[PDB]
Design an enzyme around this catalytic site. Structure first.
Site, PDB file in Angstrom:
ATOM      1  N   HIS A  99      34.779  48.465  51.325  1.00 30.40           N
ATOM      2  CA  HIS A  99      35.881  48.189  50.407  1.00 30.40           C
ATOM      3  C   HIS A  99      35.531  48.748  49.023  1.00 30.40           C
ATOM      4  O   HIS A  99      34.403  48.592  48.548  1.00 30.40           O
ATOM      5  CB  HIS A  99      36.157  46.683  50.315  1.00 30.40           C
ATOM      6  CG  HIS A  99      37.458  46.337  49.653  1.00 30.40           C
ATOM      7  ND1 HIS A  99      37.619  46.315  48.285  1.00 30.40           N
ATOM      8  CD2 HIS A  99      38.655  45.978  50.174  1.00 30.40           C
ATOM      9  CE1 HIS A  99      38.862  45.965  47.993  1.00 30.40           C
ATOM     10  NE2 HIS A  99      39.510  45.753  49.121  1.00 30.40           N
ATOM     11  N   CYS A 138      41.692  50.485  50.732  1.00 32.63           N
ATOM     12  CA  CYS A 138      42.435  49.517  49.937  1.00 32.63           C
ATOM     13  C   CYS A 138      43.254  50.229  48.870  1.00 32.63           C
ATOM     14  O   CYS A 138      42.706  50.699  47.857  1.00 32.63           O
ATOM     15  CB  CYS A 138      41.528  48.474  49.278  1.00 32.63           C
ATOM     16  SG  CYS A 138      42.500  47.311  48.266  1.00 32.63           S
ATOM     17  N   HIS A 141      47.230  41.037  49.260  1.00 31.58           N
ATOM     18  CA  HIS A 141      47.557  39.983  48.280  1.00 31.58           C
ATOM     19  C   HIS A 141      49.061  39.808  48.258  1.00 31.58           C
ATOM     20  O   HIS A 141      49.797  40.731  48.601  1.00 31.58           O
ATOM     21  CB  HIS A 141      47.135  40.306  46.841  1.00 31.58           C
ATOM     22  CG  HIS A 141      45.666  40.456  46.628  1.00 31.58           C
ATOM     23  ND1 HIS A 141      45.152  41.081  45.509  1.00 31.58           N
ATOM     24  CD2 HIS A 141      44.601  40.105  47.386  1.00 31.58           C
ATOM     25  CE1 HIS A 141      43.830  41.100  45.588  1.00 31.58           C
ATOM     26  NE2 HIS A 141      43.471  40.517  46.717  1.00 31.58           N
ATOM     27  N   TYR A 171      46.396  34.412  47.614  1.00 29.71           N
ATOM     28  CA  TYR A 171      46.349  34.401  49.033  1.00 29.71           C
ATOM     29  C   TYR A 171      47.279  33.314  49.526  1.00 29.71           C
ATOM     30  O   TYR A 171      47.033  32.696  50.563  1.00 29.71           O
ATOM     31  CB  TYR A 171      44.905  34.187  49.494  1.00 29.71           C
ATOM     32  CG  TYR A 171      44.107  35.479  49.571  1.00 29.71           C
ATOM     33  CD1 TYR A 171      44.073  36.213  50.740  1.00 29.71           C
ATOM     34  CD2 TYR A 171      43.417  35.973  48.455  1.00 29.71           C
ATOM     35  CE1 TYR A 171      43.353  37.396  50.821  1.00 29.71           C
ATOM     36  CE2 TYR A 171      42.702  37.149  48.520  1.00 29.71           C
ATOM     37  CZ  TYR A 171      42.671  37.858  49.721  1.00 29.71           C
ATOM     38  OH  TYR A 171      41.968  39.037  49.833  1.00 29.71           O
TER      39      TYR A 171
HETATM   40  O1  LIG Z   1      41.532  44.467  47.283  1.00 27.14           O
HETATM   41  C1  LIG Z   1      40.985  43.390  46.966  1.00 27.14           C
HETATM   42  O2  LIG Z   1      40.563  43.080  45.830  1.00 27.14           O
HETATM   43  C2  LIG Z   1      40.978  42.328  48.065  1.00 27.14           C
HETATM   44  O3  LIG Z   1      41.082  42.963  49.331  1.00 27.14           O
HETATM   45  C3  LIG Z   1      39.828  41.292  47.954  1.00 27.14           C
HETATM   46  O4  LIG Z   1      40.535  40.020  47.898  1.00 27.14           O
HETATM   47  C4  LIG Z   1      38.729  41.276  49.087  1.00 27.14           C
HETATM   48  O5  LIG Z   1      37.884  40.113  48.940  1.00 27.14           O
HETATM   49  C5  LIG Z   1      37.812  42.513  49.235  1.00 27.14           C
HETATM   50  O6  LIG Z   1      37.040  42.363  50.445  1.00 27.14           O
HETATM   51  C6  LIG Z   1      36.833  42.725  48.065  1.00 27.14           C
HETATM   52  O7  LIG Z   1      35.831  41.691  48.042  1.00 27.14           O
HETATM   53 CL   LIG Z   2      46.118  39.364  54.217  1.00 28.88          CL
HETATM   54 MN   LIG Z   3      41.689  45.194  49.188  1.00 28.41          MN
END
Ligand SMILES: O=C(O)[C@@H](O)[C@@H](O)[C@H](O)[C@H](O)CO
Ligand SMILES: [Cl-]
Ligand SMILES: [Mn+2]
Length: 395
Positions: free
Chosen positions: A235, A273, A354, A370
């Site tokens: 990520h 992401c 989110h 969330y």
């Molecule tokens: O894009 C993001 O910030 C999310 O996906 C986070 O809530 C998630 O915890 C990720 O794993 C980063 O820690």
């Molecule tokens: Cl989700």
């Molecule tokens: Mn994310």
């Protein structure tokens, strides 16, 4: 419709139930064993216990998010060799249970970061927000990092001084907790004192050194992941810029290229992401998917909106932010289809990531952000886009 739709669930204590998840239209759960101390081994027992609760609801545990990386690994100090050995065994245990995709990050000290957890949008719903000026006020008037002034324009510094003077005692406490106590999913939390002494471990650790520490981890973990049939999906940094005088090394396409140059194995892959990479305008999300598609093993499909000051952003509705969601989904679908054409068939799991806090959720104490309804809405929006792309281009 045929898209692999997943949903982050925190476990039995999550206010969102597995029934809510199923009614949202997700067939897969993303989760982690959050109760297990950072750096310790996830036993088969603990893994199977979570797996069974999920299967009980008529769902499958699709992705792990996340297996935490102990700070000793990132600083390359103390008990790093042991933590790495344990991380390796966690992966063995995970694969032995049939859970084959692992999401993780290398954000140092702080995980994903926001200054405001309850920002009211014109429709009355609440969004997360990263206010550059709130953050500058924290750094220069609360944390008092020397010399944080270098990360800011003269105008931002003046603005930070002005914002701070209007803050109540509780405004200042809330800003501080918001930044350092850990948001949902974070495996680290700090008091201001703990935070300030933790930053000192990074006084001789620049971008190059952090990359070196990450390389030690990757070269140790990836061969185990590959051996055991697990795919790792990093990520990105959120926000994808260096904050607090600390480097952030999973922010750009150069960083993704660096990771591949460091470990070639296909077990070494990415979580695309779009919320996080999309914070900065210079990231070409579609090109990122075109170049690194074969290694994309998980996607977070959400969007952010940059404001007048381009370092200020808030979480947008999925289709109405900076992310061109049509083009992004198209590229992912094209990637899944080339896999299928090369003979396999290997879908990319998605989660809506989110959501805004809306309707019934506005009356609740929620995990920011969330909550269920906003995430259901994003999931449904993306479902529709993807279905239309399947029919228009691949029927
Ligand atoms: O894009 C993001 O910030 C999310 O996906 C986070 O809530 C998630 O915890 C990720 O794993 C980063 O820690
Ligand atoms: Cl989700
Ligand atoms: Mn994310």
């Amino acid at each position: 419709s045929h898209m692999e739709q997943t949903w982050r669930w925190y476990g039995p204590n999550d206010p969102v139930s597995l029934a809510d998840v199923r009614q949202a239209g997700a067939t897969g759960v993303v989760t982690a064993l959050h109760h297990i101390p950072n750096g310790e081994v996830w036993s088969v027992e603990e893994i199977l216990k979570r797996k069974a609760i999920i299967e009980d609801a008529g769902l499958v545990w699709s992705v792990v998010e996340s297996v935490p990386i102990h700070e000793d690994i990132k600083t390359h100090t103390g008990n790093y060799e042991q933590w790495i050995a344990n991380y390796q065994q966690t992966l063995r245990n995970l694969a032995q249970c049939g859970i084959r995709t692992v999401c993780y990050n290398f954000m140092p000290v702080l995980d994903w970061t926001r200054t405001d957890l309850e920002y009211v949008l014109p429709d009355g719903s609440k969004a997360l927000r990263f206010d550059q000026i709130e953050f500058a006020a924290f750094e220069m008037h609360i944390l008092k990092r020397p010399g944080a002034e270098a990360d800011y324009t003269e105008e931002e510094i003046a603005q930070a001084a002005e914002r701070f003077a209007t803050m109540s005692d509780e405004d200042k406490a809330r800003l501080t907790r918001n930044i350092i106590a850990g948001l949902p999913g974070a495996e680290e939390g700090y008091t201001l004192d703990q935070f300030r002494k933790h930053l000192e471990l990074y006084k001789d650790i620049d971008k190059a050194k952090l990359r070196e520490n990450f390389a030690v981890f990757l070269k140790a973990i990836i061969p185990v992941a590959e051996e055991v049939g697990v795919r790792m999906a990093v990520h990105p940094d959120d926000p994808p810029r260096p904050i607090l005088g600390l480097p952030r090394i999973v922010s750009t396409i150069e960083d993704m290229q660096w990771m591949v140059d460091t470990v070639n194995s296909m077990a070494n892959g990415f979580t695309m992401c779009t919320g996080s990479y999309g914070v900065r305008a210079d990231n070409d999300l579609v090109d990122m998917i075109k170049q690194f598609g074969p290694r994309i093993y998980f996607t977070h499909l959400r969007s952010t909106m940059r404001e007048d000051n381009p370092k200020t952003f808030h979480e947008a509705a999925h289709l109405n932010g900076d992310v061109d969601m049509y083009e992004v989904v198209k590229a992912i679908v094209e990637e899944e289809h080339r896999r299928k054409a090369e003979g396999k068939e290997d879908l990319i799991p998605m989660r809506p990531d989110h959501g805004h806090q809306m309707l019934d959720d506005l009356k609740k104490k929620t995990n920011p952000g969330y909550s269920a309804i906003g995430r259901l809405k994003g999931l449904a929006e993306v479902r529709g886009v993807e279905l239309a792309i399947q029919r228009a281009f691949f029927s």
